[PDB]
């Protein structure tokens, strides 16, 4: 609900880590409008959150985690065609520690869900 420290603004949209989502993502591609570039980030954000300290991965985590070659457009693209297939579920969240404003959370919906 609430995003702690040191996380900021800087860190762009956020993504939450599953390894449920690391079966999952096979199984995206079984559906419509699933492409090779929404599942190269998907295999991203599933890699990056190996390493994952608090349950996110951020787009600038992800930025980094392709040593620049996907910028902060080329992640956007592939999360904005990833939700209209409905991949995943967008939550805005606050930081609400002394610190205003918000950004996005995206969290992977089951396909049993999808598909209903």
Same mark, same amino acid.
């Given at each position: 609900?609430?995003?702690?420290?040191?996380?900021?603004?800087?860190?762009?949209?956020?993504?939450?880590?599953?390894?449920?989502?690391?079966?999952?993502?096979? =199984?995206? /591609?079984?559906?419509?409008?699933?492409?090779?570039?929404?599942?190269? @980030?998907? +295999? %991203?954000?599933?890699?990056?959150?190996?390493?994952?300290?608090?349950? %996110?991965?951020?787009?600038?985590? @992800?930025?980094?985690?392709?040593? #620049?070659?996907?910028?902060?457009?080329?992640? /956007? =693209?592939? @999360?904005?065609?990833?939700?209209?297939? #409905? %991949?995943?579920?967008?939550?805005?969240?606050?930081?609400?520690?002394? @610190?205003? #404003?918000?950004?996005?959370?995206?969290?992977?919906? +089951?396909? +049993?869900?999808?598909?209903?």
């Amino acid at each position: 609900r609430l995003i702690k420290l040191p996380r900021t603004h800087k860190d762009g949209h956020l993504f939450e880590v599953s390894e449920a989502a690391i079966d999952w993502i096979e =199984q995206y /591609q079984h559906f419509k409008g699933v492409t090779k570039s929404i599942v190269e @980030l998907l +295999n %991203l954000i599933s890699l990056r959150g190996l390493r994952s300290r608090d349950g %996110l991965v951020s787009t600038t985590e @992800l930025i980094d985690a392709t040593d #620049g070659q996907l910028t902060r457009a080329a992640i /956007q =693209q592939r @999360l904005r065609a990833a939700v209209a297939v #409905g %991949l995943f579920k967008q939550i805005p969240v606050r930081f609400e520690e002394g @610190l205003a #404003g918000k950004t996005m959370l995206h969290r992977f919906i +089951n396909p +049993n869900q999808l598909i209903s």
